[PDB]
Amino acid sequence: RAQYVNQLKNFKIRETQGNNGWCAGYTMSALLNATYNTDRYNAEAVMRYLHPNLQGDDFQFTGLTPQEMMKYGKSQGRDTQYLNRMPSYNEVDKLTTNNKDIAILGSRVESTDGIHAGHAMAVVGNAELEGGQEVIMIWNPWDRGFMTQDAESNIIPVSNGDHYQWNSSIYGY
């Protein structure tokens, strides 16, 4: 379907997110595993590192702030940077070529509640489909595969039917 594909060369899906709030741990572990070419990172261990004192339900379900995500990157030797938007196709291409990882900070469009839940996902790279469409490839931690995201759209339709707006990004993992 694509005749240009640029992906982080060692990205692999090793674990998936079930009944927990560790999406940002999933995301950062997969990115850091890809860029360092390792398997030392995993969601639970990242969350334990950032939340050493939580146990029980609080440890199971408390996620990470952007600040915590940024501090984890820096702790692991990476010059991570906040981007208060979604990158362009071009920006993903360049980052990907440079073996730098991108974390997606999104929020749910749907809301029963008036609360719009936060979610973190990983960029895997970018491609040009036959016919010219520019797409960014995304790993939602829930999933055993990748989504193809129109690079002009900042709404990500996810595998349970929900929609997440790609609000911001942390690049440089």
Numbering used by the authors: 1 to 173
Study authors write:
Later findings suggested that ScpA2, as a poultry-specific virulence factor, is directly involved in the pathogenesis of chicken diseases. The domains are separated by a V-shaped cleft that contains the active site harboring the conserved catalytic triad (Cys23, His119, Asn140) residues.
Data quality assessment using Xtriage showed that the crystals were tetartohedrally twinned, suggesting a (pseudo)merohedral twinning with four twinned crystal domains. The final model of ScpA2 consists of a total of 519 amino acid residues (173 for each monomer), 413 water molecules and 5 chlorine ions. The three molecules in the asymmetric unit are highly similar (root mean square deviation (RMSD) of 0.09 Å). In staphopain C, the S2 subsite constitutes a hydrophobic pocket lined with Pro66, Met69, Lue95 and Ala117, all of which are conserved among the three best-characterized homologs (ScpA, SspB and ScpA2).
